[PDB]
Amino acid sequence: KQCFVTGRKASTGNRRSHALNSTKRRWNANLQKVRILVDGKPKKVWVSARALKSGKVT
Template sequence: MAKVCYSCGKGPSFGNARSHSLRATRRRWNPNLQKVRIREGGATKRVWVCASCLKGFKVQKAVRPVPAAEA
């Protein structure tokens, strides 16, 4: 599976790194992807989501059930 955002499809960008002498070498800019548990269709799954989608509430994070207190 490629490392792309599950919500918006954002993936790596490519370009040139420029040194002081302006020599160009190829490089890659990766998105800020976080592995999160989301709730979708009543099921919980772990997917890669970019930080901008998390901050914009574009995905619904799953909440773990709290175990009952032993008494």
């Protein structure tokens, strides 16, 4: 699950409680399934919502 255009992906870090108790966590990208024009043929692929902010034509 990566973004098709940018390369944006998930990453790992910690969830911290008020007492600073660490528990492993994940940060997923805002990936949406959209039909874009890869090399001529239309195709549905994962793109991050930020890569769609300006420049990608569904």
